[PDB]
Enzyme design. Structure first.
Site, PDB file in Angstrom:
ATOM      1  CG  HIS B 142       0.131  -4.283  -7.895  1.00 20.56           C
ATOM      2  ND1 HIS B 142      -0.697  -3.991  -6.832  1.00 20.56           N
ATOM      3  CD2 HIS B 142       1.393  -4.171  -7.426  1.00 20.56           C
ATOM      4  CE1 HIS B 142       0.034  -3.713  -5.769  1.00 20.56           C
ATOM      5  NE2 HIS B 142       1.305  -3.808  -6.107  1.00 20.56           N
ATOM      6  CD  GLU B 143       4.769  -5.019  -7.729  1.00 26.04           C
ATOM      7  OE1 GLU B 143       5.803  -4.316  -7.738  1.00 26.04           O
ATOM      8  OE2 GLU B 143       3.981  -5.019  -6.759  1.00 26.04           O
ATOM      9  CG  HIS B 146       4.807  -0.271  -7.709  1.00 30.61           C
ATOM     10  ND1 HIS B 146       4.240   0.532  -6.743  1.00 30.61           N
ATOM     11  CD2 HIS B 146       4.569  -1.542  -7.324  1.00 30.61           C
ATOM     12  CE1 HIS B 146       3.675  -0.224  -5.818  1.00 30.61           C
ATOM     13  NE2 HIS B 146       3.862  -1.484  -6.149  1.00 30.61           N
ATOM     14  CD  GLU B 166       1.725  -1.967  -2.589  1.00 33.21           C
ATOM     15  OE1 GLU B 166       2.878  -1.990  -3.055  1.00 33.21           O
ATOM     16  OE2 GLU B 166       0.817  -2.772  -2.911  1.00 33.21           O
ATOM     17  CG  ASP B 226       3.139  -3.861   4.650  1.00 36.34           C
ATOM     18  OD1 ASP B 226       3.909  -4.035   3.686  1.00 36.34           O
ATOM     19  OD2 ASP B 226       1.922  -3.631   4.525  1.00 36.34           O
ATOM     20  CG  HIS B 231       1.450  -4.538   0.814  1.00 32.64           C
ATOM     21  ND1 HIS B 231       2.750  -4.338   1.223  1.00 32.64           N
ATOM     22  CD2 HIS B 231       1.507  -4.749  -0.523  1.00 32.64           C
ATOM     23  CE1 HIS B 231       3.557  -4.410   0.179  1.00 32.64           C
ATOM     24  NE2 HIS B 231       2.828  -4.666  -0.892  1.00 32.64           N
TER      25      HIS B 231
END
Ligand SMILES: [Ca+2]
EC number: 3.4.24.27
Lengths: 5, 316
Positions: B142-143, B146, B166, B226, B231
């Site tokens: 996931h990261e 990015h 996201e 957020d 998210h």
């Protein structure tokens, strides 16, 4: 913060 | 560093033994020379200065408790590199084999992980909300996704574009988890979240509402927390992606599933050819329709299913 806020 | 490529062995956060690519020059470093311009893993030593020190080990054995988050950050970066290269013909996050850097032991009891525009950063968790976050392959992927987004669509990290950002990370984090094929699911973070509670996760793509996230555009969050709900509203897109892949009926709208591989092709093409820094949900639908049209044809089941899935979540 990135997988969650 | 300059040295010779070696193969170490250790144990990850969940107690599993794995081999890791290292480099020897006096010490054995967490430097994998087998992938692109290298994968490098660093010790932040419980501080917030980044990246910290390139991880050095005397004997090429990584079985200490302190070593476990580094083993997994290093290894799962390798899996994620392999997914993008083998599935999408993409060489690292920039498409030109950029070195992948990760730091572990960031801060004290830090309940998060993030791509910072330059590198991956993993907290250890506080032992209650999280164990060290590199233990989750979906978290790692996931990261790192990015970084792919940064070099491609560049989706601004706020409001609808940020929720797409996201969701793209949750989608590819999950597709990497399926690629590695160890306990794969459509949940996010289950391997590192709440060690005292079984069967939960941070977010669910198959049923975002299980954790209070919206599964329909009419339930979107419009406030400022957020970064405008990045998210939270990601659940609307995550649900659409789940439906494209797996099919189902949602709020009375039926979706014919087309499978994970085609989901990944459609969204990778949308991300790299159609999305822009300001894309909203409606524009993502159009980008996904066009991507499926390119790949499968305007009359294809794949295009029809993309439309059904966005219909089901209320995105026109
Ligand atoms: Ca748990």
């Amino acid at each position: 913060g990135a997988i969650i806020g | 560093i300059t040295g010779t490529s070696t193969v170490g062995v250790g144990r990850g956060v969940l107690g599993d033994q794995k081999n890791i690519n290292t480099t020897y020059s006096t010490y054995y470093y967490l430097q994998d020379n087998t992938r692109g311009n290298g994968i490098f893993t660093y010790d932040a030593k419980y501080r917030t200065t980044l990246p910290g020190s390139l991880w050095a080990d005397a004997d090429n054995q990584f079985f200490a408790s302190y070593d476990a988050p580094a083993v997994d950050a290093h290894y799962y970066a390798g899996v994620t590199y392999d997914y993008y290269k083998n599935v999408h013909n993409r060489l690292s996050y920039d498409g030109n084999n950029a070195a992948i850097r990760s730091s572990v032991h960031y801060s004290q009891g830090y309940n998060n992980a993030f791509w910072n525009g330059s590198q991956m950063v993993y907290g250890d968790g506080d032992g209650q909300t999280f164990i060290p976050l590199s233990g989750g392959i979906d978290v790692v992927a996931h990261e790192l996704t990015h970084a792919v987004t940064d070099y491609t669509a560049g989706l601004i990290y706020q409001n609808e574009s940020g929720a797409i950002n996201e969701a793209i990370s949750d989608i590819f984090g999950t597709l990497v988890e399926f690629y590695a094929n160890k306990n794969p699911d459509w949940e996010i973070g289950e391997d590192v979240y709440t060690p005292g509670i079984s069967g939960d996760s941070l977010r669910s793509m198959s049923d975002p509402a299980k954790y209070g996230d919206p599964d329909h555009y009419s339930k979107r969050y419009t406030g400022t927390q957020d970064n405008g709900g990045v998210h939270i509203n990601s659940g609307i897109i995550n649900k659409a992606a789940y439906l494209i892949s797996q099919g189902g009926t949602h709020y009375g709208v039926s979706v014919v599933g087309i499978g994970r591989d085609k989901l990944g092709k459609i969204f990778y093409r949308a991300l790299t050819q159609y999305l822009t820094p300001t894309s909203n949900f409606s524009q993502l639908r159009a980008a996904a329709v066009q991507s499926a049209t390119d790949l499968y044809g305007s009359t294809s089941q794949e295009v029809a299913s993309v439309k059904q899935a966005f219909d089901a979540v209320g995105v026109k």
